[PDB]
Structure 1
């Protein structure tokens, strides 16, 4: 069943007991923290095999 990704993330916040408005008010911060955190995976696995 399709749903907009920002609303799926608001439900996944509401699942950990953080109220939905915390995501919609901080959506740019959360998107930037996520995009940056995936960049560190890409750089970690690129940097070393271990």
Structure 2
């Protein structure tokens, strides 16, 4: 949650979480603007 996937290849590197989720969308073929303009929806859907 605080370091993403960096602690498994060396030192834990902090990065804010909203930006971690944007990277993760990029890794599946979705552009990052789709998350940032819908951040509230994805957080509501995850929490439910």
TM-score relative to the length of structure 2: 0.74
Structure 1 residue runs of 4 or more that deviate by more than 3 Å after TM superposition:
none
CA RMSD of aligned residues (A): 0.3
Query: Structure 2: any 5+ residue segments left out of the alignment?
Result: 1-12
Query: Structure 1: any 5+ residue segments left out of the alignment?
Result: 37-50
More helix by share: 1
How many residue pairs match? The answer is 36
